[PDB]
Each structure stands twice: as C-alpha cells, then as structure tokens.
Amino acid sequence: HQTHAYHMVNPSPWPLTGALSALLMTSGLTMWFHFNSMTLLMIGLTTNMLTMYQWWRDVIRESTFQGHHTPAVQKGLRYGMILFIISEVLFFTGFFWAFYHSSLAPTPELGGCWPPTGIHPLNPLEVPLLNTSVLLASGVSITWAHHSLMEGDRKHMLQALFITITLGVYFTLLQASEYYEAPFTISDGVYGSTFFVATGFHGLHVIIGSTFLIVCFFRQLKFHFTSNHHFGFEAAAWYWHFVDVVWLFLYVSIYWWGS
C-alpha cells in the first residue's frame, strides 16, 4: 500500500490513440493539400475527438468519483496549466513578431507604407470595439461565476457561466461575420497573412475556451464541483482570461495601430 498522496495512473490506451490520431491528421492535411482528398483528415479528426473525450472522461472518473486528486496532485495540475498557458503566450508571440516586422518596415513591393496600397482596413470603432466589449464583459461574468461557486451558490454560478458562454458565442458569430464582410483576404499579401492567421488562431482559441466552459457548465449541473475543489473551472477561467488578454493585444496592435 502507498503512504504518499500522488496518483499512480492505470495503464491507459489514450496516449497511443492520441499519438496515432496526430499521425492521421498530419498525413491527412498532406493528402488534402497535395492529392486533393479529405478521407484521412476526416478519420484523424474523429480518432482525435474520441481520444480527447475518453482521456478527459477518465480524469473526471479519477478525481470526482475515485478521489485521487489529493492537495498534492492538485498543486501539480496548477503548475501544469500555468506552464501550458506560458507556452501558448510564446506561440502567439511569433505572430506578433511577424506583424511588427512587416508593419514597421513596409517593403517597396507594398508601396513602402502601412497599410499597403490597395488595402481597405476595418474601422476599429465599429465591430472590433464591440468584440472588445463582449470579451471584457465575459471576464467580469466568469469572475462572478467563480465567487458564486466559492460562496456555494449553484443558481448564480450557472447563470453567470451561461452569460459567459453566450458572450463567447456572440464574439465568434460577430468575427465570422467580419471575416465574410471583409474586403481583404488571406491572399492579399502580408497584410492579409498577418491579419487572418493571428486573429484566426485567436478565434480557434475562443472556440476551445467556450467548449471548456460548456464542459464546466454540464459538470456543474451534475454537482461535480465542491465550493473548495473545482480545478477544471479554475483552469477554464485562467484559459479564458488568456484568450481575453490576447484579444486586447490584437485589437491595439493590428486593428488600431496597424490601420
């Protein structure tokens, strides 16, 4: 019998099926980009979701139902999640670097100016400003959600969390809308490239964060979270603030200054 507080995890097939699903998604993109075919990509996407679903299912089984998340285990998960966010900060930094590289030194081929000749930028005081207010508002509502949980208030937690998710979804539809209305494309040179790749990665992150809050919502409905033990929700909240802060830097850098 063990006299430490750490979790010895049952042998699991999900690491292997995640690794193999990574192969199927990267093969699949290669088959898509070059041999115009999506089959392999479709299978890899499917095995990826089935893996994410069963892996995180077991984590809930291990924590809520089997009680393996001692305070020691919980300290580890906090560190793991801060470290993952930090790695995502450095990822976005490459896209900010690329943008600042191009915009502070516009080449002759653009007309030696920013924005480039021929580019009609969005107004930052229109939908960009609305997007900004939707996300900042959602940071207030998720904070209310957190304090409600800590004070033991099920109804207000769910209400605040619901508002948070609605605002996340609103931001996504407004951004889809802006993408479609926009008079430049990803192919409109380095302005289009920096714009759609930076904002598009961020948008993907809004969707991942929204999904995570929705998982949190259904878990709260089923009384998984105690007033003291709810790390799944803390992680979702930290991730959401990250998505918020990244939007502010995008708004200031790309929408306001680089227009």
């Binding site: 507080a5 139902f65 001692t70 033991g152 208030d153 207000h156 937690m157 009384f223």
Partner: protein, 96 residues
Amino acid sequence: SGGGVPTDEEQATGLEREVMLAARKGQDPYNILAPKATSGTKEDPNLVPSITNKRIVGCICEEDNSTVIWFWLHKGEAQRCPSCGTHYKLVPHQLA
C-alpha cells in the same frame, strides 16, 4: 443566496477524503508534511514511521548542505547517519 453546491466534507471520497480527515486529527499518514527533528541522541532518536521493515532516510546533516545523505533504516536498534552520527529508529506501521 441559495446553496446547492456540495462541500468537501459532504462529497470528497477516496484518498482525498482520507488526507482531509487525517489532517483534522493533526496526523500525516501520506507524508505530505516535513517531520520535525529531535536532538537525535541515543536516548532521543528521530522516530521514523514505516509500514514495513525498512525505510530510506535522507539526512541533511547541517542546514544549507546541498548534499543529502541517503541510507536504509531497518527495524531494530537505532542506526546513525554515516556522516553526522544523529540517531534514527524505525517505529511502526498502521497509517492506513
């Protein structure tokens, strides 16, 4: 304010519950805390709980030493650190 959110007291299970109960009775069966040292003499040895006949002891002989001295402590007479000579005695078991 409504309620509806369970407490740890109500809903904590397995080892989380065990660690939580044991904590309230000022006890540390899962070695979450640093044990406090005695004078470590023959008559006042460091008492080393173990659920078996032997347990690895690490002795930080002087504060701020960067090197821990490692040895197996067995059931029986008090043993000494090979380096500073402080005394350790294996006491029992039970824990869980």
